[PDB]
Design a protein around this ligand. Structure first.
Ligand SMILES: OC[C@H]1O[C@@H](O[C@@H]2[C@@H](O)[C@H](O)O[C@H](CO)[C@H]2O)[C@H](O)[C@@H](O)[C@@H]1O
Ligand SMILES: [Cl-]
Length: 420
């Protein structure tokens, strides 16, 4: 009789269950096991996972967002996977920002195996920068170059061949629960942080001088006319759609847009569009205190009530390992989490994907706190109010400071009270 393993995943790929079943079919055959997959919507998965964790009933493996690893690990419900990670090549096999997501911050044992990385870089219209007299090498080198490039893009008379209208210089979604990930590289490039250990415990640093310098630099680009009114009312998918449709000269996204530019609109791509034929990528520009690439993605964890921890760890080694890494990155439009897979020809032969791997060298993640969930909720609430002021042209350094002072009080309260 076939042995059984159960895995919970989120919708990472176009046919989530079918793709995952294709991914693991070789493992199934090699180990005489049927891997049962259950797909959870991103918005319901956290509660289903915490219900599994406290009830002691659930799958053998679950996908976790990198930002969830601290909270679940602090519940004491995850099997240590230092063995699996040593098998896959240890600390040196991962970018440091990815390695940080294998455990609760400061914890003795690893509780999650890196599966795939989300990262962000700037897509840009090669045609629009040429017409505006902007060298992408200079525009994406520094904050000064970035803003000077947007000023040249705003002044340009260039029109999209299909829309027959001007392009907005920069699009950024102002209506998203993931708004903190778009702010994070500006906070970081100014020498700031969302949280910092201050007198030995974690506190908000959103109201630090450096955090406020970075956030004002980014949010003030909208107030200067570089981001349209309508973008601040849109979500991540709607901004991708606006770039595909020729409305934006520059926007931040992940690697999946490259594949989408190769596929016809009938298959959900944008190969027919001017943007697909005039596509550039550059990493985030260097701020005054450094250059940082937002990293996220997903890991896999083993529940300590699993009835077959040895076979589950063979599946973690398979999913974390070279061949499965490349294949699942292709399926999902993400990067491999395993650093050795960044040298696969399927990343090396495409110049746009080579640029993503250059951006990956600056990768940075949030601290893996047990309380991260509450921190991010509160940060997003107050960043939402800051974007609201941007819409009215009423974001001053003082109004931003007042909002991040409110966020910091609330975050510090949440961090003190986190239940164990
Ligand atoms: O906040 C949970 C996790 O969110 C992950 O991002 C997901 C995107 O990659 C996917 O495209 O959309 C879903 C639905 O909005 C996102 O949740 C991040 O990659 C993780 O780092 C994060 O823990
Ligand atoms: Cl941070």
């Amino acid at each position: 009789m076939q042995k059984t393993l159960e895995v919970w995943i989120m919708p990472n790929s176009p046919q989530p269950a079918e793709d995952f079943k294709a991914l693991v079919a070789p493992f199934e055959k090699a180990h005489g096991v049927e891997v049962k997959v259950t797909v959870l919507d991103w918005g319901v998965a956290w509660t289903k996972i915490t219900t599994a964790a406290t009830s002691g009933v659930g799958p053998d493996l679950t996908q976790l967002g990198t930002t969830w690893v601290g909270a679940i690990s602090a519940m004491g419900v995850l099997e240590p996977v230092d063995d699996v990670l040593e098998a896959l090549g240890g600390e040196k096999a991962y970018l440091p920002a990815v390695w940080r997501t294998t455990r609760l911050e400061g914890a003795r044992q690893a509780t999650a195996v890196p599966w795939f990385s989300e990262l962000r870089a700037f897509y840009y219209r090669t045609d629009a920068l040429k017409a505006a007299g902007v060298n992408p090498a200079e525009m994406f080198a520094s904050w000064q170059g970035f803003e000077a490039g947007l000023a040249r893009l705003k002044a340009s008379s260039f029109r999209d061949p299909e829309t027959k209208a001007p392009l907005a210089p920069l699009c950024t979604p102002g209506r998203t629960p993931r708004t903190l990930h778009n702010a994070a590289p500006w906070i970081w490039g100014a020498g700031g942080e969302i949280v910092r250990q201050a007198g030995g415990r974690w506190q908000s640093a959103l109201n630090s001088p450096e955090s406020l310098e970075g956030l004002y630099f980014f949010l003030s680009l909208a107030q200067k006319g570089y981001v349209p009114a309508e973008s601040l009312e849109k979500n991540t998918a709607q901004i991708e759609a606006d770039f595909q449709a020729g409305k934006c000269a520059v926007f931040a996204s992940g690697p999946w847009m490259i594949q989408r530019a190769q596929v016809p609109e009938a298959k959900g791509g944008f190969a027919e569009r001017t943007a697909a034929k005039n596509l550039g990528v550059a990493p985030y520009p260097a701020g005054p205190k450094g250059r940082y690439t937002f990293f996220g993605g997903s890991n896999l964890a083993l529940f300590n009530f699993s009835k077959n921890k040895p076979l589950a760890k063979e599946l973690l080694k398979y999913l974390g390992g070279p061949e499965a890494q490349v294949r699942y990155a292709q399926m999902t439009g993400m990067l491999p989490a395993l650093r050795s897979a960044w040298s696969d020809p399927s990343f090396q032969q495409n110049p746009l994907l080579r640029t993503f791997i250059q951006a990956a060298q600056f990768g940075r993640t949030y601290p893996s706190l047990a309380g991260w969930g509450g921190v991010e909720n509160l940060a997003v609430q107050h960043l939402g109010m800051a974007w609201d002021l941007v819409a009215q042209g009423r974001l001053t350094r003082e109004a931003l400071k007042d909002l991040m002072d409110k966020a910091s009080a609330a975050i510090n309260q949440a961090l003190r009270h986190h239940h164990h």
